[PDB]
């Protein structure tokens, strides 16, 4: 696998993704677009949901690939967030799309569920919901 590479993923804060990739806890990688109307509104929701006591059971993070999918190139994306709101958004910078390409991310949002062992257990293209989240807590095979 690529554990070393996954640990090289630096956030827009310049901090390693290790801050949310330890303690043998499941990780939830959510991809988003910078200049998108739907993603803009969802940004506030991401923080609100990430602060939920129930959602605090998984490491929910927001990853974007600078320069990938015609998004903001490296050096511009991190600068964009620097002028944005919410000083508590776990935005990770995936240079080149090391994660996006490996999961064939062609549409946002993308919900990548990483197991407690540091492996991709589930991958959903689209939007999730509370009922679906509860289903995932019951059975990780309950896709869609």
């Amino acid at each position: 696998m690529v554990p070393h590479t996954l640990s090289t993923l630096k956030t827009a804060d310049n901090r390693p993704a290790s801050v949310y990739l330890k303690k043998d806890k499941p990780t939830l990688i959510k991809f988003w677009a910078s200049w998108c109307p739907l993603c803009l509104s969802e940004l506030g929701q991401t923080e609100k949901w990430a602060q939920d006591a129930k959602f605090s059971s998984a490491n929910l993070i927001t990853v974007a690939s600078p320069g990938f999918l015609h998004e903001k190139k490296d050096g511009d994306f991190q600068k964009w967030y620097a002028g944005l709101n919410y000083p508590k958004l776990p935005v990770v910078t995936d240079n080149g799309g090391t994660i996006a390409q490996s999961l064939n991310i062609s549409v946002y949002p993308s919900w990548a569920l990483i197991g407690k062992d540091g492996d991709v257990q589930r991958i959903v293209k689209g939007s999730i919901n509370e009922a679906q989240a509860l289903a995932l807590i019951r059975d990780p095979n309950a896709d869609l």
Binding site: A33, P37, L38, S41, L69, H70, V107, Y108, P109, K125
Partner: protein
Amino acid sequence: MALDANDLLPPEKAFVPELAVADDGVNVRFRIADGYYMYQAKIVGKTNPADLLGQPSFSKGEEKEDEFFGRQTVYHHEAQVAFPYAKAVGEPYKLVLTYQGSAEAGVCYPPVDTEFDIFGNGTYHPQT
């Protein structure tokens, strides 16, 4: 083929890019699935050897109200953009296309950009 509508199908197959190369210019007609919509203000399309293109001639669709963009022209199924050359030379040209839009189901896909090399073939499709 059996649907091509709603959010049940991923963007990779929800778009049918029909490339029509003519003698006057290049006309790109990508069929959008019934449920997805692209922003004409974010659609990137240009083809030329050394930047010898006049301007991207869009067909113009309908105006869509928005909360952030206010209101812009969008394509929900109809999409045709003609690229007229400003120089009449039999030289090879590159085609830069970028598909940016969203789905009525609340899905926001990134601007998947695909560059094609026009060497002479008539029809062209992305090698994904």
